[PDB]
Amino acid sequence: MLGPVLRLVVKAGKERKLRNFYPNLYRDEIAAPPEGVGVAEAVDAEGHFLAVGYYDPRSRVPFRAFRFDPGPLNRAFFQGRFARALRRRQGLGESHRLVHGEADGLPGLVVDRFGEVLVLQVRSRGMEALREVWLPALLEVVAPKGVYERSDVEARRQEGLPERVGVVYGEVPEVLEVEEDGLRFPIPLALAQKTGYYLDQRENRRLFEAMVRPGERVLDVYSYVGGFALRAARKGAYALAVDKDLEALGVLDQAALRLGLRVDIRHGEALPTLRGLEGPFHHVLLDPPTLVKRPEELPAMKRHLVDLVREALRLLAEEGFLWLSSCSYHLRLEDLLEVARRAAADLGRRLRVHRVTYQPEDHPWSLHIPESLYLKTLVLQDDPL
Amino acid sequence: MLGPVLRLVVKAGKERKLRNFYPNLYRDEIAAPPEGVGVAEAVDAEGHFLAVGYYDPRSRVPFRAFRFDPGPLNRAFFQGRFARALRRRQGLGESHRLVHGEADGLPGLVVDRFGEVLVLQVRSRGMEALREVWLPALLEVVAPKGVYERSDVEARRQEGLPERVGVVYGEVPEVLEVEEDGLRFPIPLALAQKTGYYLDQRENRRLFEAMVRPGERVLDVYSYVGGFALRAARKGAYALAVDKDLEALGVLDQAALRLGLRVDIRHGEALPTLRGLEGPFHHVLLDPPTLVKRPEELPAMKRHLVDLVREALRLLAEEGFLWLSSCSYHLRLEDLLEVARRAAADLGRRLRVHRVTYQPEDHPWSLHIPESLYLKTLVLQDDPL
Numbered sequence A, B: 001m002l003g004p005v006l007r008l009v010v011k012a013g014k015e016r017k018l019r020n021f022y023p024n025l026y027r028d029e030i031a032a033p034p035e036g037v038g039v040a041e042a043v044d045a046e047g048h049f050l051a052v053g054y055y056d057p058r059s060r061v062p063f064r065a066f067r068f069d070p071g072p073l074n075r076a077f078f079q080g081r082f083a084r085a086l087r088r089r090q091g092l093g094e095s096h097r098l099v100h101g102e103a104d105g106l107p108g109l110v111v112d113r114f115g116e117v118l119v120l121q122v123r124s125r126g127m128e129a130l131r132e133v134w135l136p137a138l139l140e141v142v143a144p145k146g147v148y149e150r151s152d153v154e155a156r157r158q159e160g161l162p163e164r165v166g167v168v169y170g171e172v173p174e175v176l177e178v179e180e181d182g183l184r185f186p187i188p189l190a191l192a193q194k195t196g197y198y199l200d201q202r203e204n205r206r207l208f209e210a211m212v213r214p215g216e217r218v219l220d221v222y223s224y225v226g227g228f229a230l231r232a233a234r235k236g237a238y239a240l241a242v243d244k245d246l247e248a249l250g251v252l253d254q255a256a257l258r259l260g261l262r263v264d265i266r267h268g269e270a271l272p273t274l275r276g277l278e279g280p281f282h283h284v285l286l287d288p289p290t291l292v293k294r295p296e297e298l299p300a301m302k303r304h305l306v307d308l309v310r311e312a313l314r315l316l317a318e319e320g321f322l323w324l325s326s327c328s329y330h331l332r333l334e335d336l337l338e339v340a341r342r343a344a345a346d347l348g349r350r351l352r353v354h355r356v357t358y359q360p361e362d363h364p365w366s367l368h369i370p371e372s373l374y375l376k377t378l379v380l381q382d383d384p385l
């Protein structure tokens, strides 16, 4: 009744990654491709089962494993995946990531939860092709009031997929009211499409708020909608938020107005802005985009980070705290440490490593997917003898 | 009149380390040593000031910098160092590390505080030579009821120093009552390990206790006096503590009895004991001793850890937590990840990295002194799809 099962044969000796729960197979690791595009079973050289997933040569990864046990990629399968995801996020409040792609056994799907509204992103050909199957499953398990789709245009384009933005189900407000620990950020959907909201900094934002003392001065660089700055203000500190996105600063402005809190705002670029500040500030926070495409780009990126951190440290009060985050898998903690050491040497400052943090639980770091870890943060305190 | 300032000259280009707050200068890095042994000033090839410290060719490190600004290593200097150290530990409770060597600007000195009793160790010739100077300063600033000295016998010998164990000030009880979060461990000081107690695990113990649910089973391996095990018991879990030190397990028994808590105990070695257990356990904690004392020993110790972690994972219940600590500078997070991946692959288990932690604030990690960081912990959760 059906066409023959699509079956992929993995090169001998390259099946170990799949057996060890790494979901991606590239072209050179496939001994024999399936006789078409779609849901496929992967087997080893001796024909033993390895995975069921999606085969499509047009995808950046030709085979992405969806499951590591036999079975279909049907409605019930997706129901179980979303049920697992939901359970993993129990007690994580109302604003959190629900689905973090392959780490949640759902390659190419990101789902963020803001109260009763979901915002999702589809990043791979397999997940796009299975949309008619998994979406009803998602709606059934979560039962949201509405679902919005945003697009990583370049990610879609690299997968040969069209951009896709809009309400996919139910009702989504024109202004998404993102709530985090009593703070409400009114984010217009246009901004939600372009950027979104950085749920991955939630635990850093909580740690930061507990450290702020009334009367202190805070510099929140790459602030976006000002999660850090607003918390500083709530604690009685003076905060200056810096971002090049005027739309994002507009949200921070409104969010601060709602609470009768005063936050200073600078619309401008991080490095030029910091070069024009005198300081000092008791906390300086840096959350730069650190786009690294190739490893050879790393020394140049680290030199730029040194320029930024040198200004940040110059602006740092005695015994103050400097927060340096990187959201690239290619930029390791060791690289951040090197950057900090170079900047400190330029200024003759002595620093202590106060905390090192990694992305929170709703953005799972899988042991088996080395690139699962992308966000890490180095918190330094000025430590004079 | 005094003799000329003892003056050491650093080889051209090797002075950057000292300028950047790394205190150790090695034989191959010294162009011209001072006249004799004792308090010496280090200057660069151009004669500019670098540091004041202690020069002694008998020490592992011929020159250790005590201060990076001009001045004597007198009583007032040490008073200032202990005052700084004391202030850094405000709000860290009544028990904590007070002085963590070089990271606290006091090379070769460790001071732990247990209420009104200090336990210290002196690890290099400089500190030993200056004890008539710094001990009264320590007593003046901290005003303890008693001070006990233990020796890292091996380290002392490396410095050409004798064993020193005993009371060096005031009154120290035969049995040191170490208090931590409502737990009281009666530790006989004579048969105690190191300073008596592992204060470096305090934050991990707190994190762990918050995760234990009643009825769960806990396996606490390398338990020492049972800080983890006892916390499990108080939360209503069944705990089995494993350690090869019968004296330490005796302390655990007394601590548990005082609180009316039941903890199971196995006197035995970790790997043999785990090989004979069936399990499963909801939490498995592995806190091995240093293990890797020299870099050459790393591969053999990683093979041992793979064996240990394989058994621990086999013993881990579905969705259970596995804690793996390393307290050696030579054994890094990346090594722990590698060990975990190998063990998980052997068993066909899928794990998530739940938390990575580093040593607490009272054991400062100086950006400028890599070896000030020795403890890091990988916490994994079983993560089936």
Ligand SMILES: C[S@@+](CC[C@H](N)C(=O)[O-])C[C@H]1O[C@@H](n2cnc3c(N)ncnc32)[C@H](O)[C@@H]1O
Binding pocket: A198, A201, A221, A222, A223, A224, A225, A226, A227, A228, A242, A243, A244, A245, A248, A268, A269, A270, A271, A287, A288, A289, A327
């Ligand atoms: C990863 S987000 C920071 C998130 C923020 N820390 C939070 O807690 O929500 C990076 C931000 O940097 C801004 N940005 C990118 N390049 C910039 C630059 N050169 N100068 C200032 N802001 C920049 C973007 O607008 C974006 O809001």
Ligand SMILES: C[S@@+](CC[C@H](N)C(=O)[O-])C[C@H]1O[C@@H](n2cnc3c(N)ncnc32)[C@H](O)[C@@H]1O
Binding pocket: B198, B201, B221, B222, B223, B224, B225, B226, B227, B228, B242, B243, B244, B245, B248, B268, B269, B270, B271, B287, B288, B289, B327
């Ligand atoms: C770093 S301490 C563990 C401290 C403990 N986890 C705590 O929180 O206090 C290492 C412990 O390992 C024990 N030990 C050393 N080798 C062992 C072995 N082969 N088997 C079992 N215990 C061992 C020592 O007696 C010591 O108590």
